[PDB]
Amino acid sequence: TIMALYSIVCVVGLFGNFLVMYVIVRYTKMKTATNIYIFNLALADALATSTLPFQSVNYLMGTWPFGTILCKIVISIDYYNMFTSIFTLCTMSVDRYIAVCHPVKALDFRTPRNAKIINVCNWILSSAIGLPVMFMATTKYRQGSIDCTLTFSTWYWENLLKICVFIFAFIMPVLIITVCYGLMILRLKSVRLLSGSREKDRNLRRITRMVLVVVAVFIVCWTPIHIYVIIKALVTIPETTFQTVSWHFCIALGYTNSCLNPVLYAFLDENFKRCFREFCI
């Protein structure tokens, strides 16, 4: 039955993203700074959800049939998503911060053309974890069924990769986002008019609320899996059926976040809400 649930979320995951991805390009009215980052976020989620049928098929076969390079690319996508999503959210939070606190500087510093380079900078930065993880990935003939796993030079590297990913992928971006929004709330809850007009302050507050909701959903969804990985790699918990089902539920909950964003944009943003029905009309 758990296989059906994965099928439901995956189909919605790809269904939401490409429709969102097409929309941002197919209308000049959505070329603002935030949609550039939304494009990257949707791209990352769509790539992360592309490998779901490949991985899930291995339940009933237990043998990787596709090839070693495809296992390499799947592991690479999985390891990319965790970095790219969080770094994109951090960049979004920083962008909203400069928009709120420094509107005069943001007038010249937030152009979309120069905000496009932030995406490739994010990809380059995540590439440092993408390629080595991609590098060691290659199929190895197990004790009777082909297993797509990793290899090292292991008591050192298997722990080193985990501590590095936990430190440089979760805690620092979470702290940066928290500080940014702590400044944002202080700025918002004291000034009555930001841009000097009633037609801009409302839109700015609405867009900041949307960013906050997306960030909170992402944090809630992705929190359990990192803690579970750390505790599993530290304490060496004795195996149990309940432990197995909890560990699998954590991964499922982590993956389900990729399909929520295209729907979460529908009930918070007016442009996307109207233009979804515009296609349907």
CATH number of the domain that residue 131 is part of:
1.20.1070.10
Residue ranges making up the domain that contains 276: 2-280
Dihedral (Cα; 188, 189, 195, 201), 10-degree rounding = 90
Write the residues followed by a gap in the chain (C–N more than 2.5 A): 153
Query: Distance (Å, rounded) from C-alpha 233 to C-alpha 224?
Result: 14
* DSSP string for residues in 143-176: SSSEE-------TTHHHHHHHHHHIIIIIHHHHH
Buried b (16+ CB within 10 A) or exposed e, 83-100: bbbbbbbbbbbebbbebb
Query: Distance (Å, rounded) from C-alpha 259 to C-alpha 21?
Result: 14
Four-residue CA torsion sign, 106, 109, 112, 117: negative
Resolution (A): 3.9
R_g of the chain, CA atoms, integer Å: 21
For 105, residues 6+ apart whose C-beta sits below 8 A from its C-beta are: 98
Query: Distance (Å, rounded) from C-alpha 216 to C-alpha 209?
Result: 11
Q: Say if residues 74 and 149 touch (Cβ distance below 8 Å).
A: no
Q: What is the largest CA-CA distance in the chain?
A: 70
Way the structure was solved: cryo-EM
Q: Say if residues 158 and 96 touch (Cβ distance below 8 Å).
A: no
- Report how many domains make up the chain: 1
For residue 146, the cross-strand partners are 141
> What's the token pair of residue 43?
């791209």
Query: Distance (Å, rounded) from C-alpha 117 to C-alpha 8?
Result: 35
Q: Indicate the length of the chain as a whole number.
A: 281
